[PDB]
Enzyme design. Structure first.
Site, short mmCIF file in Angstrom:
data_model
loop_
_atom_site.label_atom_id
_atom_site.label_comp_id
_atom_site.label_asym_id
_atom_site.label_seq_id
_atom_site.Cartn_x
_atom_site.Cartn_y
_atom_site.Cartn_z
N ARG E 351 58.65 17.73 18.63
CA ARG E 351 57.52 18.59 18.32
C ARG E 351 56.35 18.33 19.27
NH1 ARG E 351 58.79 21.00 13.23
NH2 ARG E 351 60.28 19.28 13.01
N1 ADP Z 1 56.60 30.90 20.75
C1 ADP Z 1 57.17 29.99 19.92
N2 ADP Z 1 57.25 30.21 18.59
C2 ADP Z 1 57.82 29.32 17.77
N3 ADP Z 1 58.34 28.15 18.18
C3 ADP Z 1 58.33 27.80 19.48
C4 ADP Z 1 57.73 28.73 20.45
N4 ADP Z 1 57.84 28.15 21.66
C5 ADP Z 1 58.46 26.96 21.49
N5 ADP Z 1 58.75 26.75 20.19
C6 ADP Z 1 59.43 25.55 19.64
O1 ADP Z 1 59.78 25.75 18.27
C7 ADP Z 1 59.47 24.59 17.49
C8 ADP Z 1 58.86 25.01 16.17
O2 ADP Z 1 58.28 23.88 15.51
P1 ADP Z 1 57.68 24.04 14.03
O3 ADP Z 1 56.78 25.24 13.99
O4 ADP Z 1 57.15 22.69 13.61
O5 ADP Z 1 58.98 24.36 13.14
P2 ADP Z 1 58.92 24.21 11.54
O6 ADP Z 1 57.49 24.57 11.20
O7 ADP Z 1 59.94 25.20 11.04
O8 ADP Z 1 59.28 22.77 11.30
C9 ADP Z 1 58.51 23.75 18.31
O9 ADP Z 1 58.99 22.41 18.40
C10 ADP Z 1 58.49 24.37 19.69
O10 ADP Z 1 58.94 23.42 20.66
MG MG Z 2 56.42 23.32 9.80
#
Ligand code: ADP
Ligand code: MG
Ligand code: ATP
Ligand code: ATP
Ligand code: MG
Ligand code: MG
Lengths: 54, 468, 45, 503, 482
Positions: E351
């Site tokens: 992350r």
């Molecule tokens: N434009 C984007 N939208 C959503 N996720 C992205 C985007 N670009 C990269 N990512 C990757 O998607 C992952 C989403 O993380 P996160 O939002 O914490 O997922 P969740 O909230 O479902 O745990 C990030 O680690 C990031 O590296």
């Molecule tokens: Mg989350």
């Protein structure tokens, strides 16, 4: 001659692939039924144990 | 009324009263604690004994310790004075900026609005995201869902929505972080401080913060959503302004309820959830509605365990949301961000009588061609792509182009991808997808449509790649 | 009765799904190369 | 005037007092109150608390009586007095409920004044036996070509609307409700159908949207909307199907025809599971109690077609089941499938494949069969069903249909055209004569030359033409109920002329 | 006899001792038995106290006097524990003498709030090319090393432990990382072998091995992660950076399940207690990066989860994945295919990502990540310029990612190797000889061109002059080797 032979062999190979796929389908269907019954039994056992331990 | 603690089993504390028994859903103050420990009455066990859920750690409690009753449920400091202030589950400020001096206090437990108070009107809230504004458009004053697994992009998507909408929103906004990482909360707090949304120097803040994170006991995580939606309710009813309510993640409310259910003395329901899952979830959700007095636009992030949308916790939430956005792991693994599933997202306003004939036709054509691509993938698996007919090769190419053009860089995601954030207007999205459906860009490579904004950017990227 | 649906080969993520993905990518890489060459030739005009 | 009428109301109300049977609340929690005393309480009897909340005494245990609460449990304290009403739960019934939105207990929630109901009917009355019923023959026109053609529904038949979420079940029910307008506002009494929509576990905004949709279509004037939203307590959601069933039984007993649509019976099952678990009743598969098949069975069996001796009325039930990932082997889906006669199956894949409504004709069945159809609709529908079955047999080769047999290609073309005919827009029900005309134009091979994508445009234009210029033929088909040979020749001429002039 | 500050055992069974009395005992308070065994009062029932025994219960019998200690269970904490192998309660078990710690800290202290934390900036070098390139780990982040049995999770952890030696014996105080290892459920032979490995690499001098082995009672295995967490928190709140490895949290969950079930608490999903998610969440949330107002310290966490047959969708693995910031998926299929460490870079995420990563490594890792993504797109099964070249480049990068065990690499050397791989200096060589070339190039660069590596390390990024010099040396070494 080559196109006739190729079409015949294509038909035979596709038939063999379909037979193998059907065999795999029935084996996986048996496995899926076993897994479904196991999942139902496990979840019900968890519910019963939780109720009894109360 | 003073009661004594008789059982401290886990996070559930049993308090025995003698003179005045507090009603259910009453905040109890535990005397002798260095901090403020609040117990919420959950059950009447009989014999003048009440079973309570702790809003903080139960360590240090001793049987016989005195417990007071507030005479009312958990009351939080509410009003215009809570803007820019982070507050705990019980209303205490946790931003080290002093007390939240306000003239109003509201109980976090309240009745849902009546049937006659429901507002049937529904506009369209353009967000600038191609997939959302095309296939599952959001409605002003409507409930929005962000179903997704672990790592699909729920937090990034809701952050981008905050960036795009909250700043442009005339009314106030409320963010209620329920059972999430404290690192994410600190990041959001600093981002909104540096973005001007939260201003520490003067009272021009537009976002209130309510934070109960995963380090909190299950009692706390089962009530922070109520606190945030109570602040939203005040901003909706007492003041006629529009409200934005961002919740991340709402699943932790159900998870916290399940965690406390076993000790509360309940026979477990399916998959180990509480038997009162649907009841409490509905009681919470119905409060987050657009009434005739005001409108609350709720953007709730919903965690889907194991990416199984048939799980009861995400399944029950579908009936509570107008527009739903399902982020799928398969699409994310392909690199398409946002990972919104085009064939799973739904919106109530998706209708020719509402969004117009052209928008509905474009969206339905995109969905149909993607479904046909899904059908043809199975044939390609065995037959081979080179062995397909010339007609369906064109359909597969168009579907690939549409899949790549659904992707869009985000301003909040600049740190990861490096691309400049884009905000495509609705008409631009409609025109671009209609042109792709018509085949006007069958001569451009599929790489040109990946991580671009308007179709003009797609053609610019195509010719730039051609230059090299 | 247990049934199936459309596009279930890639959902399983087995050998056939990876094979289909690789075949599609290899075909469309060549198609993108040809389209880029044609676009460059057009832009030279 | 307002003060005068208020004082008239208050003087009209009489503050009588009398003896009662009362008990104390030993323990209250999660909407379940354990009441001490109340010796002379019947099982499943309404009792009211001191705070004003009502309740239902379900568990008559020796030491205490377990009562479910019709509201929030915060208003019930330990030691509160629980009075005995003395009667099993009953709901207001009659023609006065038409046009009104009521809760599970019949109380008006639309803010349009009290219900002028003159009769009171229980919610747990037994279904009619074998003798009073008769075989279902009269059609129940849903207005959807797919339903009225391949999965017909008769008056007195329990037809299931099963499918995953966001597939069109509520849309099917609401267009079935809308379609009955042409019969209700008419003159033929034996064709009027009073719809009763029961909403279970749905947000009040959705119910308000549905009510607005019905009001805009002038369908509320013969429709009762029993609402038990997600905010309402689990007992209300449990009772709502039974309240709606009693409201339909009133029409059924008086010779009238009623349509009852239990929306999301799965949510009612969830509420009953919650009540049973909180009552410490032993659980079973998926934590549902053992008497969960009983719950839906004793409810749906009340849908029946009475004979002429009992009045000739009817009550058609349209339960809605929300399957998870299309798993019909789950507990509640299996129960409801076993209880009902047939089901209308909706699939997400078909929904996003352009086949809207998403009715999967392969899985959708109707055990009452063609006996619930008009003669013309039956005549066209037999051929359409046979041809569509033949097409679905050979639908696998559609990807490589170019290098196939001539018969296979003909079957593919006919099936594609029939499938394009089955598509229909939302909130646009069709009259039976219009549907039979379209299906006739399709099955008789008047679309094979036409482009498959142009069927919808041709269908709309042909419907407009036949409604405008050839209204006499449609009226004759509707009145006669069958496509006779003379009408067959007239239809042949009309379709030939329109097909010639279409280009 | 007093019944407020002492009590007697009503019933002792399976490590659970019901106590009559202790009217003034607190929740989670450590109590002391007659035989010297210590306990922890978890269930404060109306007429009895449920005490979990920290050790063997054969010495506890009905009627024994149970006495309070007056303090919630706490662990000896400080920098004296460096180089010491302790148990869950902090007692020394390596026979090196007593611990000289002067301070104690509760094992259940609350995690830092929103305000004390700051963004994750400093990188946490592990010495693994795959981790330091494609799944970077920041300081204060919590990465889950998830996988099946015998896939390399403990190997990754110990390699991360060893890699910190270069920083710890260095000069600057801002790069020192005081490692901590927690062994939960492992047999004592494995822990002894691990500490022997650490001593062989001289990594013991800055690490603390908290062991709650399988023979130890379930309460000890449940308390072990919190003890190590407190030991790390000591460094975190005093301006020092610490690393904590929980190996493995699944066995801690099993121990907690045993404790709860023996305490008559109702079972939940898979017999686990309802608050298994809370058990880990209140633990991993204590891994934070404090800002300058709180000393600027940090506590990086590396939890380990064991998955049965790669079922990543199980209860505890899903909970831990949801809690953590990133996952390092280890797959047995990749392990047997020769890819060791078997880090599935397709699913492995971070992350924090590029936020905490040195500039040169990020610059080359972007290209490497793009090339490997394209290779994975075209991996399984004929343009020589488009597909075959891409396939070959992906194979070269995959062979580059492979690394030996117990041999962590310096960050600048990793940057040099990845630069050599990315800029097409290995497409000519056979895939088999890539590892040999990498070893020889490592030797040559660490011998002759140490000045270049020092320049890269000091600058933190590869500049035009550095890029040209690296191109020169890699070309010369390629010419010499082949
Ligand atoms: N434009 C984007 N939208 C959503 N996720 C992205 C985007 N670009 C990269 N990512 C990757 O998607 C992952 C989403 O993380 P996160 O939002 O914490 O997922 P969740 O909230 O479902 O745990 C990030 O680690 C990031 O590296
Ligand atoms: Mg989350
Ligand atoms: N025949 C149709 N043609 C086009 N769109 C339709 C049709 N029927 C329904 N829809 C649309 O499909 C969506 C879902 O419809 P509906 O609410 O009836 O489904 P549902 O499965 O009953 O819903 P839920 O599971 O949320 O209760 C709505 O947006 C509706 O407008
Ligand atoms: N990078 C590597 N290169 C070569 N072999 C390796 C590597 N990492 C691990 N191994 C091998 O894996 C085995 C030990 O793996 P390790 O103990 O790290 O795995 P684990 O998943 O933690 O195991 P366990 O469940 O037994 O604790 C040894 O045979 C060792 O040689
Ligand atoms: Mg619906
Ligand atoms: Mg190991």
């Amino acid at each position: 001659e080559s196109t006739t032979s190729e079409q015949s062999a294509r038909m035979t190979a596709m038939d063999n692939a379909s037979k193998n796929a059907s065999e795999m389908i029935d084996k996986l269907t048996l496995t899926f039924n076993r897994t479904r019954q196991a999942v139902i039994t496990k979840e019900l056992i968890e519910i019963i144990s939780g109720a009894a331990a109360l | 009324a003073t009661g004594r603690i008789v059982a401290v089993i886990g996070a559930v504390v049993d308090v025995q009263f003698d003179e005045g028994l507090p009603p259910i859903l009453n905040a109890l103050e535990v005397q002798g604690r260095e901090t403020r420990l609040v117990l919420e009455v959950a059950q009447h066990l009989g014999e003048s004994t009440v079973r309570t859920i702790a809003m903080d750690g139960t360590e240090g409690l001793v049987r016989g310790q005195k417990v007071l009753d507030s005479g009312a449920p958990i009351k939080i400091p509410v009003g215009p004075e809570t803007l820019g202030r982070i507050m705990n589950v019980i209303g205490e400020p946790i931003d080290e900026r002093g007390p939240i001096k306000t003239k109003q206090f509201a109980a976090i437990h309240a009745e849902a609005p009546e049937f006659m108070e429901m507002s049937v009107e529904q506009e369209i809230l353009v967000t600038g995201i191609k997939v959302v504004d095309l296939l599952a458009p959001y409605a002003k004053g409507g409930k929005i869902g962000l179903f997704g697994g672990a790592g699909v992009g729920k937090t990034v998507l809701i952050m981008e929505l905050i960036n795009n909408v909250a700043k442009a929103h005339g009314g106030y906004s409320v963010f209620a972080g329920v059972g999430e990482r404290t690192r994410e909360g600190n990041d959001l707090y600093h981002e909104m401080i540096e973005s001007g949304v939260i201003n520490l120097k003067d009272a021009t803040s537009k976002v209130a913060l309510v934070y109960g994170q995963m380090n909190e006991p299950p009692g706390a995580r089962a009530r922070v959503a109520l606190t945030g939606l109570t602040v939203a309710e005040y901003f909706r009813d007492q003041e006629g302004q529009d409200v934005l309510l961002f919740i991340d993640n709402i699943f932790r409310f159900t998870q916290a309820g399940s965690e406390v259910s076993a000790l509360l003395g309940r026979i477990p329901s399916a998959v180990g959830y509480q038997p009162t899952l649907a009841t409490d979830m509905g009681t919470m959700q119905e409060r987050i509605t657009t009434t005739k007095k005001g409108s609350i636009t709720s953007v709730q992030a919903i965690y889907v365990p194991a990416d199984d949308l048939t799980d009861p916790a995400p399944a029950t939430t579908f009936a509570h949301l107008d527009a739903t956005t399902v982020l799928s792991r398969a699409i994310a693994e392909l690199g398409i961000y946002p990972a919104v599933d085009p064939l799973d997202s739904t919106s109530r306003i998706m209708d020719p009588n509402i969004v117009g004939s052209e928008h509905y036709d474009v969206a339905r054509g995109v969905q149909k061609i993607l479904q046909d691509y899904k059908s043809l993938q199975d044939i390609i698996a065995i037959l081979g792509m080179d062995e397909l007919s010339e007609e369906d090769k064109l359909t597969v190419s168009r579907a690939r182009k549409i899949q790549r053009f659904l992707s869009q860089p985000f301003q909040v995601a600049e740190v990861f991808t490096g691309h400049l954030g884009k905000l495509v207007p609705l008409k631009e999205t409609i025109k671009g997808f209609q042109q792709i459906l018509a085949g006007e860009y069958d001569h451009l490579p599929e790489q040109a449509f990946y991580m671009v904004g308007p179709i003009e950017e797609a053609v610019a990227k195509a010719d730039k790649l051609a230059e090299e | 009765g247990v049934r199936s649906g459309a596009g279930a080969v890639r959902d399983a993520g087995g050998a056939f799904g990876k094979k289909e993905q690789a075949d599609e990518e290899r075909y469309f890489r060549a198609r993108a190369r040809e389209q880029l060459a044609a676009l460059k030739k057009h832009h030279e005009n | 005037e307002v003060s005068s009428i208020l004082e008239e109301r208050i003087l009209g109300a009489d503050t009588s007092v009398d003896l009662e049977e009362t008990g104390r609340v030993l323990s209250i929690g999660d909407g379940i109150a354990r009441v001490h005393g109340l010796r002379n309480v019947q099982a499943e009897e309404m009792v009211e608390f001191s705070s004003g909340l009502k309740g239902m005494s379900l568990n008559l245990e020796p030491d205490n009586v377990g009562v479910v609460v019709f509201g929030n449990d915060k208003l019930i304290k330990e030691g509160d007095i629980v009075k005995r009403t003395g009667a099993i739960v009953d709901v207001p019934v009659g023609e006065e409920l038409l046009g009104r939105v009521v809760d599970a207990l019949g109380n008006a929630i639309d803010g349009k004044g009290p219900i002028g109901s003159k009769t009171r009917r229980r919610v747990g009355l037994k279904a009619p036996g074998i003798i009073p019923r008769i075989s279902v023959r009269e059609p129940m026109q849903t207005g959807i070509k797919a339903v009225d053609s391949l999965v017909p529904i008769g008056r007195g038949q329990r037809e299931l609307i099963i499918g995953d979420r966001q597939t069109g079940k509520t849309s099917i029910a609401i267009d079935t409700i809308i379609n009955q307008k042409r019969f209700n506002d008419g003159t033929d009494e034996k064709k009027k159908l009073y719809c009763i929509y029961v909403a279970i576990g749905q947000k009040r905004s959705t119910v308000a949207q549905l009510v607005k949709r019905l009001t805009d279509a002038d369908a509320m004037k013969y429709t009762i909307v029993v609402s038990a939203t997600a905010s309402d307590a689990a007992p209300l959601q449990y009772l709502a199907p039974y309240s709606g069933c009693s409201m339909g039984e009133y029409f059924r007993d008086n010779g009238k025809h009623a349509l009852i649509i239990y929306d999301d019976l799965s949510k009612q099952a969830v509420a009953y599971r919650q009540m049973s678990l909180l009552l410490r009743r032993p659980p079973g598969r998926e934590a549902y109690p053992g008497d969960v098949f009983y719950l839906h069975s004793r409810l749906l069996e009340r849908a029946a077609k009475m004979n002429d001796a009992f009045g000739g009325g009817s009550l058609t039930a349209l339960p809605v089941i929300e399957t998870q990932a299309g798993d019909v082997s789950a507990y509640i889906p299996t129960n409801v499938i076993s209880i009902t006669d047939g089901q209308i199956f909706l699939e997400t894949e078909l929904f996003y494949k352009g086949i809207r409504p998403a009715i999967n004709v392969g899985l959708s069945v109707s055990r009452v069969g063609s006996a619930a159809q008009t003669r013309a609709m039956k005549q066209v529908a037999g051929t359409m069903k046979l041809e569509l079955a033949q097409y679905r047999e050979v639908a696998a080769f559609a990807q490589f249909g170019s290098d196939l047999d001539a018969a296979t290609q003909q079957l593919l073309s006919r099936g594609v055209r029939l499938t394009e005919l089955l598509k229909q827009g939302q909130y646009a029900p069709m009259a039976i004569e219009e549907q039979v005309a379209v299906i006739y134009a399709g099955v008789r091979g008047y679309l094979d030359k036409l482009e498959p994508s142009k069927i919808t445009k041709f269908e709309n234009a042909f419907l407009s033409h036949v409604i405008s210029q050839h209204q006499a033929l449609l009226g004759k088909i509707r009145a006669d109920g069958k496509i006779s040979e003379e009408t067959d020749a007239k239809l042949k001429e009309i379709v030939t002329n329109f097909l010639a002039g279409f280009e």
